[PDB]
Amino acid sequence: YTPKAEMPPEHLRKIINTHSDMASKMYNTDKKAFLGALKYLPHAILKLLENMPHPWEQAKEVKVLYHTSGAITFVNETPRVIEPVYTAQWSATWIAMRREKRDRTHFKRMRFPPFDDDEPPLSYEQHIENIEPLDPINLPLDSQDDEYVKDWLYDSRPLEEDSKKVNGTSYKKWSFDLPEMSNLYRLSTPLRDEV
Amino acid sequence: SERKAINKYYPPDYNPLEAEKLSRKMAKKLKTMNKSHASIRLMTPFSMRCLECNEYIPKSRKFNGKKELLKEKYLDSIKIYRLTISCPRCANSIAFRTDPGNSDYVMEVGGVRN
Amino acid sequence: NEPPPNICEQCLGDEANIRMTKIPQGSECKICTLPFTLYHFKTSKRSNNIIKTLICVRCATQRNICQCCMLDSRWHIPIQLRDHLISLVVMTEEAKNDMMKRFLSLKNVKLGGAQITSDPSEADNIVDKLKNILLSFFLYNSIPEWKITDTVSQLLSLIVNHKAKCGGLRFQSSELGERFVSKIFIIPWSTAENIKLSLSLNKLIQLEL
Amino acid sequence: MSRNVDKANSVLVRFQEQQAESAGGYKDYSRYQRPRNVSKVKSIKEANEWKRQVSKEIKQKSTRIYDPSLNEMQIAELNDELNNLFKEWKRWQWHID
Amino acid sequence: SWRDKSAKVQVKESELPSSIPAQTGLTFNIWYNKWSQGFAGNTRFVSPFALQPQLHSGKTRGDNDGQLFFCLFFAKGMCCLGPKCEYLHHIPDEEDIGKLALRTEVLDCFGREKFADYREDMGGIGSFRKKNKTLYVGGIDGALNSKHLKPAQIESRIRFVFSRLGDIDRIRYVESKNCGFVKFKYQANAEFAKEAMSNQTLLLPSDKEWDDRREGTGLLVKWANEDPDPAAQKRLQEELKLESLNMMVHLI
Amino acid sequence: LPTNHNKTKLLKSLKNTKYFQQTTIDWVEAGLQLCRQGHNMLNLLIHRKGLTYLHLDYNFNLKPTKTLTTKERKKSRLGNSFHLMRELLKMMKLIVDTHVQFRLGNVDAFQLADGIHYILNHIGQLTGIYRYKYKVMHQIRACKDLKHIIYYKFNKNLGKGPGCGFWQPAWRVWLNFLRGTIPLLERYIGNLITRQFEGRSNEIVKTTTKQRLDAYYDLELRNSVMDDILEMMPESIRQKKARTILQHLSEAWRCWKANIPWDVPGMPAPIKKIIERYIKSKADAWVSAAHYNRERIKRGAHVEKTMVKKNLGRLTRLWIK
Amino acid sequence: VAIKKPKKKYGTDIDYNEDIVYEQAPMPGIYDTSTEDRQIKKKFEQFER
Amino acid sequence: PLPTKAEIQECTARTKSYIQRLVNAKLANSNNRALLLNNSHHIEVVSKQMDPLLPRFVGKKARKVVAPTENDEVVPVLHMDDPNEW
RNA sequence: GUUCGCGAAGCUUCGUGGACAUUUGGUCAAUUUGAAACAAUACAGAGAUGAUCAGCAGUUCCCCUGCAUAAGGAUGAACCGUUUUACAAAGAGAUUU
RNA sequence: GUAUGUCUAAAUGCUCUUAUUUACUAACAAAAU
Ligand SMILES: [Mg+2]
Ligand SMILES: [Zn+2]
Ligand SMILES: [Zn+2]
């Protein structure tokens, strides 16, 4: 029937924050709900992991379902891509990585875990406000060779909404012109290396 | 949660030396740790008779004893211990000492060896 | 398979349409502590507070009572009272034990009296039988204070011990008292002899402990 | 630290106890030995707790001393112990407040 | 007259209604909200608040809508919702009682399920099997901070607190048992009183120990196990008989 | 080949209720929520279980506060479900944590990528899943293989060092692993929570187990013998006699084992005969079993030390006989 | 008198009556039985006293 | 007589329907995924969708329950009719 | 508020008839009194058998850990006690009618 | 595999000693050239 109400994220955030110091007879049932939710926590994990923003992406917005109790939150969308485009993107990223390696005398590899065992993971509200997330991995393009792909190649939804090159916002089917395809192929030389 | 647990959780502020000091301060006050006759499980090597009710507790029979330190050591730097037991039937405190000169024990106003 | 809910006329409401939800093994019955389907209805759509069923159908059947009201299905009287009446013309002993209560619930005997209430024959007969059977100021000289207070009000803090029988009313106003005197069981200010004696005795009793 | 006592008096546990005492005021008057000389206890609550503990001890003593082997000397000894406990209890009922 | 006396109530504001638990134990159990790994502490602590009803009692959001059940929090004396509370804020009057007398078997005046068996300590929300209007009062020593008072005085105090809270049937202080039996007209009223006076001090401002009333332990208000001595029993029987008669009359 | 029937995925069902509502969220935010929510769940469950002394880090590494007494330990041994869940949560945190770091000015995009890659390859070292479910070992191996391949492709002209991104295949592998778990965890974790709410009535043990088989068999035999004896002749107060019969049977068995002739004078022909027959049956079952065991031993076929000892003893006895 | 502390919801076999089996309503039913029972119980009150 | 074919079929249907129903009920009960009147007055029963996190059957808690036999009718246990050897 | 019509003042404003949209949520209400457990102190303290020890079951209106129809729980818990009648036949001696 | 069970009314800081342990647990396993 009638679709779900697109709620504000703010509400969700508030809900989450409420169930941090949860120890009253108020939300007795919320604790029960939380307990129940273990059932689907692995599913949730799988979802979230699946939606991992790719290195050509500063920050992915993602669809989310969440129990109004605040017990569990599923990333809802399943991330589909235009396969060749995706491959091209990956190739580009690979190239960038290689370049970085070439450049850097020492490459500062992360320490693990990234936050301390004592320190409770900062809420998202500490770094919404923070400066523009630093630039992601997308190689230096050129207008002559990669003329067609450059505008969209590194976008969250690899090809834009409301275009004639994909089905639409559902992003279920794609049809490409030749030159763009050619460009993609050229890009993907590292990965698609097939006989 | 598992007997071979590598690391016990500590609070985020746990100055270990300080903690130790605190414990020490609250060790004189403490009931257990500040007492004698600390428990032990032991089998009986002597195989002896409980002097009150004549219950013939045989060799190797297991008991939850009390080991206590005897202040008067043997020679100099090798300690000797009183090892309290109860007879099964009557609750008479049997005990024995471990004088290591003979590599054996001594009865201590509990029962008699036979 | 499930039997139907036994909710009384006054319990349920005054309207020709009520919507309710059933919650199979919702709660444990209060008597028996054994899972059963909760029916809960709102009476009128907008009238606040729900009416959940507090007992299992079986238990209700046994006691012959409304699953909400806990009153006789027929006469709408508390179980004690209804049973008491029957006795007057034997009462139920709910066994208040973890295990035994459940067992009792599962038995299907109609505990005690319930049978009489159920049958038109028996209930009616009982009723008939019953019918036949039927056919400042101190205060001195047992009855409750809520009655005394009412009386005082009519006449227009009110302490009364019963072992003493010595009620020291304190209106704290000269107006209220002087109205109270004119508008009118010994009542002084702050067989008479017999009464005095009795009062004295009462006082003594009060004072020995 | 087998047999539980050791675990109880392991340093970590002690530290935890201390922390509790500091913040909120959880003491275990079972855990510490009751003091010998009263009037080194300005707080009332503490005193009350001590009294309670001694009462408990007395009760425990009572429970055991009516055992069937009445002629054994342990019982006799306890009789004196019981008396001592009673005395202690009485003392604890001092008249400062 | 609570309706025309006031509308407002606001007993204890939502800034400071309560801290959540009181530290027994070492660690705090998130699921039960009760301290664990230890149990040392008599636990019962005196209410920071109280029902001064003449001041507090008022119209509510419930009154307008036609709520049956009275506000537990109001009774306790800490209903931060106040005028926007959905439960009623006044001492249960007779009319109200009459109105909810159908439901009063299964659940209290607070709209919460009466049980089949009494709690072993007679401690809370009485059984639907045994109707009752009769409260055990106890811990009166502790509620008055171990004050050397006259029994009579104590009794008077009890009366003062309880009369205000509901229409009294009869009250008895006892020196030997060290208690205060109260009986009410209506069960609902009794329940309300119990709710109010649970963990309450019996002390007054004029007393010298007013500022340290918090440090004590409050009134232990519970349900009355029926009095065994014979006159009382006889009276009870008579009452029962009367009730039966009334019922019969209603029936015919 | 997948489900013909099932359209109804999990999320859809949830959506169909009123209790879920849906927003659009930044992925990092979502991750954070998951971490927090997940953490809460694990604490809440733990607290319910009663064990308040196993403290969860916010990194999901669970470990005990004090050293637990034995009773406490017994109470508080969580199993293969809960631990698995914890591990999963930890993994999530690690990937989510890296992204959080990236978002914050703390770490470059390249660095973030590399970190992610490290996590996915090093799941094995980074956090114990494998401990609790040791088929994650396969996944780990696969990841390692990928790393080997990917690194060799990626560092051809370029030299050895850290900074290889290209986490994709590893990520994919982990996702696929998670698929399998979803089901297992839903049975496991779900079951656990059910137990916590409503904890089992009358479980039935199963004699297909190596342990308990023999005893069970013996019991059955005894029962059969008793039944036969009952069938045989009339008795008054037979319960008492049953015990005696059982004892007799036992004695007979012992005799057989020893190779003593079990001749008792009072034993009436029929009952005695029946007992003899059942002991013969037992012997047949026993001797054959022993032989089988011996054969197994000869092969090298997962014999129990105790079982082997028994065989040695039994076989010796047989030889003697 | 102090009761035996319960372990996991058991019955105190004084009250409640334990798992009762019926008298089994028969054909030659007579009401003197109840009276007899009452009489018997009367004596035990006296004993208690 | 060996029972009538039609009758047999009917019996099968009855039991088949019943057993199937029972199985369905059981399935419903399992926690893994994959109108009325009182007295004269008419009343609509509903089933509200509870939240999928909270325990489905919040009533049940694995309770022990002793049942009475409740055998009111008396079973007739009918029958017919060297001790030193046996 | 949207608006599609009627009637008055100067397409702008008032006054009206309609259409559109139409009964949420609660088995729950925030601290002692409707029921969590460990822990702690004290006191004892470990299946047969003489002793020491393994494992398996069994009965139950006892459960716990365990995903568990694995496995593990003090040999997981309590079982070790009480125990006089479908009551007969024969012989000998004694008091009462 | 670190057993177990009953039992429960609702002085302050100070420092100095160490190349150790009155340490405890035994459920686990047991052979020679
Ligand atoms: Mg064992
Ligand atoms: Zn009703
Ligand atoms: Zn309120």
GROMACS .gro file of N, CA and C (backbone and C1' of nucleotides) in nm, chain G residues 7-10 18-19, chain I residues 37 61-64 77:
model
   60
 1195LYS      N    1   1.350  -2.310   4.667
 1195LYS     CA    2   1.465  -2.306   4.574
 1195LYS      C    3   1.421  -2.267   4.433
 1196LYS      N    4   1.316  -2.332   4.383
 1196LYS     CA    5   1.261  -2.301   4.252
 1196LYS      C    6   1.112  -2.335   4.249
 1197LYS      N    7   1.031  -2.241   4.299
 1197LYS     CA    8   0.883  -2.254   4.311
 1197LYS      C    9   0.827  -2.394   4.344
 1198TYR      N   10   0.832  -2.429   4.473
 1198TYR     CA   11   0.780  -2.555   4.527
 1198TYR      C   12   0.657  -2.527   4.612
 1206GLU      N   13  -0.188  -2.982   4.802
 1206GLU     CA   14  -0.111  -3.060   4.704
 1206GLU      C   15  -0.199  -3.108   4.588
 1207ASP      N   16  -0.140  -3.177   4.491
 1207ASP     CA   17  -0.215  -3.220   4.373
 1207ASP      C   18  -0.328  -3.316   4.412
 1360A        P   19   1.676  -1.476   4.212
 1360A      O5'   20   1.834  -1.465   4.224
 1360A      C5'   21   1.923  -1.571   4.181
 1360A      C4'   22   2.028  -1.518   4.086
 1360A      C3'   23   2.173  -1.529   4.131
 1360A      O3'   24   2.222  -1.658   4.098
 1360A      C1'   25   2.132  -1.311   4.045
 1384C        P   26   0.788  -3.432   3.707
 1384C      O5'   27   0.687  -3.322   3.764
 1384C      C5'   28   0.698  -3.183   3.730
 1384C      C4'   29   0.674  -3.098   3.853
 1384C      C3'   30   0.777  -3.111   3.964
 1384C      O3'   31   0.885  -3.023   3.939
 1384C      C1'   32   0.558  -3.125   4.055
 1385C        P   33   1.027  -3.080   3.896
 1385C      O5'   34   1.120  -2.951   3.904
 1385C      C5'   35   1.124  -2.872   4.024
 1385C      C4'   36   1.260  -2.808   4.041
 1385C      C3'   37   1.323  -2.748   3.917
 1385C      O3'   38   1.274  -2.619   3.884
 1385C      C1'   39   1.484  -2.875   4.033
 1386C        P   40   1.186  -2.599   3.753
 1386C      O5'   41   1.280  -2.509   3.661
 1386C      C5'   42   1.393  -2.564   3.592
 1386C      C4'   43   1.521  -2.521   3.659
 1386C      C3'   44   1.633  -2.478   3.567
 1386C      O3'   45   1.608  -2.345   3.523
 1386C      C1'   46   1.720  -2.629   3.724
 1387C        P   47   1.649  -2.301   3.376
 1387C      O5'   48   1.806  -2.277   3.390
 1387C      C5'   49   1.855  -2.189   3.493
 1387C      C4'   50   2.006  -2.197   3.502
 1387C      C3'   51   2.081  -2.190   3.371
 1387C      O3'   52   2.091  -2.055   3.331
 1387C      C1'   53   2.172  -2.363   3.501
 1400A        P   54   2.490  -3.348   4.218
 1400A      O5'   55   2.361  -3.260   4.250
 1400A      C5'   56   2.375  -3.131   4.313
 1400A      C4'   57   2.241  -3.064   4.330
 1400A      C3'   58   2.134  -3.146   4.401
 1400A      O3'   59   2.153  -3.132   4.542
 1400A      C1'   60   2.046  -3.064   4.199
   0.00000   0.00000   0.00000
